[PDB]
């Protein structure tokens, strides 16, 4: 088997994780107690879901997950919620004191007290794997636990598991939903320290998700529950090739090999279609050609940038549900003739296409309609550097006056680490420009 | 003119 | 005219 361990770090990672695991249970027919009543195979049926679940000797399917937060509040909601019986109590790790929106407190101070406990719990899950592939880490760039504890964790995972792939699902901070002023600092510091440890990182801009919920779901003011349900569909579409029998991206190493030509340029732009409100569920079903054309519209992207200002290094189209390869090829040919799609000269103008026949599932009473077919486009494009430049500009404005720096130095972080992290981000922006 | 160049090409030969 | 220019270039080359 080819097992994957999911790690959910801080409030954002835990809340996204909780929404993703609800959706995985619904897609595999697992009940909130971990029972699977359609599983007539007391033994090895379609063993593909054993990538993310472990069967216990009581017929209970338990997630290969660890949840970590430095405060108890968000994990206590998981311990008391609908899926409280799904997880083992040892997988739900809580501190007493939080990182207070400070990277340095999350990395050096409070993170150092809890890290060895987290690594012991991860090791207990790794020891239950016959062929551990890697890790999927869920965190926020802006929050102190999501930044500082994740960098410390990613370093220690590279030491203990240096041949195992590490995928990230990172929440990029947005002003409209932002809880801290220092979110740019936390984001630059964590991106610098995780850059050499990640094999592939899926950025999710909260501003992009918020605008999709407003425009496509008609929600005047999206909550984190609305955002996390949409994020859960994208994450589910990315992981669907690892959870079900399929032809493309059947392991974590295939993601790096298909999407990441250069080790530093490991940030694929995700785009998901269709996003339709549950009230519009009885409308005309979108064709394969319409949903594929919606992947090249900036209004449906997971990061706010314009791929028309950059180049494509790689492009993967992951279809789910009622999709035939003939109609996909006809859609791609129509898109290549009508759209400005500039690939880099040294990379083949090739789309990798995955089709999983399992239709998209939606959470009952969620904001999303049941659709017959969906597509997730994963594209490595130089236009994602527009998100780095926006973060770097906010960093530079505050750092030029040393605003808030004393909170990080007060936790024992050196002022030089800000300059080093900013220099590495300037090198990353230049790497993207030289490729573009 | 085109005729001028025709004459020039003769001269060049 | 584009043709005269071409002829001019050719003439220059040959010259």
């Amino acid at each position: 088997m080819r097992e994957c361990i999911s790690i959910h770090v801080g409030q954002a990672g835990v809340q996204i994780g909780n929404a993703c695991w609800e959706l995985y249970c619904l897609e595999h027919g697992i009940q909130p107690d971990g029972q699977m009543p359609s599983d007539k195979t007391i033994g090895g049926g379609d063993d593909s879901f054993n990538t993310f679940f472990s069967e216990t000797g009581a017929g209970k399917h338990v997630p290969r997950a660890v949840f970590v937060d430095l405060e108890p509040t968000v994990i206590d909601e998981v311990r008391t919620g609908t899926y409280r019986q799904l997880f083992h109590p040892e997988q739900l790790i809580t501190g007493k004191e939080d990182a207070a929106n400070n990277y340095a407190r999350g990395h050096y101070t409070i993170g150092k007290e809890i890290i060895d406990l987290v690594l012991d719990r991860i090791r207990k899950l790794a020891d239950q794997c016959t062929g551990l592939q890697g890790f999927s880490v869920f965190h926020s760039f802006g929050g102190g636990t999501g930044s500082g504890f994740t960098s410390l964790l990613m370093e220690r995972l590279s030491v203990d598991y240096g041949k195992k792939s590490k995928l990230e699902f990172s929440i990029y901070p947005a002003p409209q939903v932002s809880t801290a002023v220092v979110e740019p600092y936390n984001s630059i510091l964590t991106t610098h320290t995780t850059l050499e440890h990640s094999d592939c990182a899926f950025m999710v801009d909260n501003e992009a998700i918020y605008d999709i919920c407003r425009r496509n779901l008609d929600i005047e003011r999206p909550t984190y529950t609305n955002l996390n349900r949409l994020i859960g569909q994208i994450v589910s579409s990315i992981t669907a090739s690892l959870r079900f029998d399929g032809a493309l991206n059947v392991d974590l190493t295939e993601f790096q090999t298909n999407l990441v030509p250069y080790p530093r340029a490991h940030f694929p732009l995700a785009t998901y279609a269709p996003v339709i409100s549950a009230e519009k569920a009885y409308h005309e079903q979108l064709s394969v050609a319409e949903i594929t054309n919606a992947c090249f519209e900036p209004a449906n992207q997971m990061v706010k940038c314009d791929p028309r200002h950059g180049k494509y290094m790689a492009c993967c189209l992951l279809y789910r549900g009622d999709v035939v390869p003939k109609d996909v090829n006809a859609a791609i040919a129509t898109i290549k003739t009508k759209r400005t799609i500039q690939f880099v000269d040294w990379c083949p103008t090739g789309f990798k296409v995955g089709i999983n026949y399992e239709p998209p599932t939606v959470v009952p009473g969620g904001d999303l309609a049941k659709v017959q077919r969906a597509v997730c486009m994963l594209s490595n494009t130089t236009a994602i550097a527009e998100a780095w430049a926006r973060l770097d500009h906010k960093f530079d404005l505050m750092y030029a006056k040393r605003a808030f720096v004393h909170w990080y130095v007060g936790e024992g972080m050196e002022e030089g680490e800000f300059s080093e992290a900013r220099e590495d981000m300037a090198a990353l922006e230049k790497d993207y420009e030289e490729v573009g | 003119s085109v005729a001028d160049y025709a004459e020039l090409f003769k001269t060049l030969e | 005219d584009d043709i005269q220019y071409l002829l001019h270039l050719e003439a220059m080359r040959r010259f």
Binding site: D251, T257, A314, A333 | - | -
Partner: protein
């Protein structure tokens, strides 16, 4: 006897190989349990070429199923004929190749290869007179491309005097899983040039354009493409599987089709083109079959035969027809189009007829052309390779497995040398 050992490597190889076995088992009157239920002795006369006889008058394919991941092979075992295969001949890894030729050739496939060779040896030791090997694989992937060429090289080391034949699926951007397919294909073409005697070039571009333009399928699936491949493979292998005027073996075919040792890449074709489940109520005439089999629209390599010359041609007609009408139509095509055949190979067009038609047709024709026009397929892969290679795009996936950039430069040059060699004999 005259035995063949079949190998099917990776996802595409196992899917096409499984469809080939389904088609020929039905032509031989063999059920999914390995039992014979035919009505003609001609179905059994040469069955030993592809089947072993087992206890209780059962026929078991001399087939070896190879993959670096279990998913395709479990799908084959659950398939309509999945129980006919010898269970010991399912050799598989767990790590997968991840569409990487270096993983198939140097790493994951190099750990599994000795276990495959032990099954190859066990099947070969049971043959009375082994003719050779046939491989089904794709050149775009990791397992079929990298591990398939490693297996070919190891079989040629252990059995240097035996014929090696391949059904090689060539990648196209129209039917692409990954952007690195040109790298995998160029690295594999270099290994085929040195280590095979016959390579059937099956272009996914040609198969897609046949399904879409000719068969009017608006959204062709891999199942529709594999239908065309399995019909062509049945066609090509007909002279090995049934008695006929040419008691063919693989070596007689190679000696007739290959004038130069490096120029063994064939363009296969089939007539009439049918879609899965569409019954043609009208049988074609012999002139209509002969005209269709030489039409570029019936070729499974996306090259125009009018852009080159035929070195050699084999034509296999199937079904009850006037053999005189076949010769008259074949001579009519040659005499009208003589410029498209090389003059320095006299009588380079060979024709065979078999009375047993394929299922659902009364008559069919299979075409095999060694044409200099096949250089267009290699030029198209070369252009896609160089477009990425000039930027070292995606090379980190291969150098991470221990490949040098010089191995890519050698494979690019050897493929350009093959294109130049085809151009020399065209002129």
């Amino acid at each position: 006897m005259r035995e063949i050992v079949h190998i099917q490597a990776g996802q595409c190889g196992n899917q096409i190989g499984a469809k080939f076995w389904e088609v020929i088992s039905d032509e031989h009157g063999i059920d999914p349990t390995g039992s014979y239920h035919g009505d003609s002795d001609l179905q059994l006369e040469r069955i030993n070429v592809y089947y072993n006889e087992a206890a209780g008058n059962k026929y078991v394919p001399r087939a070896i199923l190879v993959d670096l991941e279990p998913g395709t092979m479990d799908s084959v075992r659950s398939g309509p004929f999945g129980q006919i295969f010898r269970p010991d001949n399912f050799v598989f890894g767990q790590s997968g190749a991840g569409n990487n030729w270096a993983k198939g050739h140097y790493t994951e496939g190099a750990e599994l290869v000795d276990s495959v060779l032990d099954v190859v040896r066990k099947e070969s030791e049971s043959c009375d007179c082994l003719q050779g090997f046939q491989l089904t694989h794709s050149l775009g992937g990791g397992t079929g491309s990298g591990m398939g060429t490693l297996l070919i090289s190891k079989i040629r080391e252990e059995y240097p005097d035996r014929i090696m034949n391949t059904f090689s699926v060539v990648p196209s951007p129209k039917v692409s899983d990954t952007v690195v397919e040109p790298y995998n294909a160029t690295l594999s073409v270099h290994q085929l040039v040195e280590n095979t005697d016959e390579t059937y070039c099956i272009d996914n571009e040609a198969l897609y354009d046949i399904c879409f333009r000719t068969l009017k399928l608006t959204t062709p699936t891999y199942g529709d493409l594999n239908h065309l491949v399995s019909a062509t493979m049945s066609g090509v292998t007909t002279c090995l599987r049934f008695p006929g005027q040419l008691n063919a073996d693989l070596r007689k075919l190679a000696v007739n089709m290959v004038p130069f040792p490096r120029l063994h890449f064939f363009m296969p074709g089939f007539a009439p083109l049918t879609s899965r489940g569409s019954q043609q109520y009208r049988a074609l005439t012999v002139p209509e079959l002969t005209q269709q089999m030489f039409d570029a629209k019936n070729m499974m390599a996306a090259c125009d035969p009018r852009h080159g010359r035929y070195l050699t041609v084999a034509a296999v007609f199937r079904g009850r027809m006037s053999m005189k009408e076949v010769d008259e139509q074949m001579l009519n095509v040659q005499n009208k189009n003589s410029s498209y055949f090389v003059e320095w190979i006299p009588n380079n067009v060979k024709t065979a007829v078999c009375d047993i038609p394929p299922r659902g047709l009364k008559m069919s024709a299979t075409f095999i052309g060694n044409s200099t026009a096949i250089q267009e397929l290699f030029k198209r892969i070369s252009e896609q390779f160089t477009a990425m290679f000039r930027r070292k795009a995606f090379l980190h996936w291969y150098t991470g497995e221990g490949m040098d950039e010089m191995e890519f430069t050698e494979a690019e040059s050897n493929m350009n040398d093959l294109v130049s060699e085809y151009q020399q004999y065209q002129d």
